[PDB]
Specification:
The structure is cut from a larger assembly and holds chains A (60 residues), B (49 residues) and C (53 residues). With 60 residues, chain A is mainly alpha-helical. Helices cover 42% and strands 7% of the residues of chain A. Chain A has a two-stranded antiparallel sheet. In chain A, strand 1 and strand 2 form a beta hairpin. In chain B, a hairpin with a 4-residue loop joins strand 1 and strand 2. In chain B, strands 1-2 form a two-stranded antiparallel sheet. The chains are: A mainly alpha (60), B mainly beta (49), C mainly beta (53). The structure holds 2-acetamido-2-deoxy-beta-D-glucopyranose (NAG). 2-acetamido-2-deoxy-beta-D-glucopyranose binds next to loops of chain B. It is classed as virus.
Chain lengths: 60, 49, 53
């Protein structure tokens, strides 16, 4: 597929540098991810990995 | 000195996925039909153009 | 499952259309209404959230 980008880091679109639980790790930087990758549906699948959230320390 | 810029535009609706009207254009039609023939004790039927 | 409403970046609105006409800080306020379903179905957007906290 195509990789997503937080303006310097070309990560896999559902696998950021903060894979997973982007909002728990970095809330306002996930908001900047929303501000930057609003064109990107793979970023929306990453958001879905925070909507059907599967964190590290949370077993769900 | 408190002001409010305000902004609006028009989009399509929720209906446009399945519920929509069609201004539609047509011209010279087609001549097809369907006929049943009794022929030698056979009520037999076909459909053609 | 499907815990989505942690990411509701607020649209915090002092509701003008509160009781008896005038305003109050109402989170139950309506923002968008859809009725164009031909079966008399009413899609109403409340400014609060249920289900997922
Ligand atoms: C054949 O079709 C005619 C109508 O066209 C009907 O009156 C008649 O009963 C039919 N006969 C048989 C044997 O199917």
């Amino acid at each position: 597929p195509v990789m997503c980008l937080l303006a310097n880091t070309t990560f896999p679109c559902s696998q950021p540098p903060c894979t997973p639980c982007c909002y728990e790790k970095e809330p306002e930087e996930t908001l900047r991810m929303l501000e930057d990758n609003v064109m990107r549906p793979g970023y929306y699948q990453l958001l879905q990995a925070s909507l059907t959230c599967s964190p590290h320390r949370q077993r769900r | 000195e408190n002001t409010q810029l305000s902004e609006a535009h028009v989009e399509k609706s929720e209906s446009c996925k399945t519920e929509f009207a069609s201004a539609y254009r047509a011209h010279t039609a087609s001549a097809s039909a369907k006929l049943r023939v009794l022929y030698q004790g056979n009520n037999v039927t076909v459909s053609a153009y | 499952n499907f815990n989505v409403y942690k990411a509701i970046r607020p649209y915090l609105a002092h509701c003008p259309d509160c009781g008896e006409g005038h305003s109050c800080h109402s989170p139950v306020a309506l923002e968008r209404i859809r009725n164009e379903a031909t079966d008399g179905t009413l899609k109403i957007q409340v400014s609060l959230q249920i289900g997922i906290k």
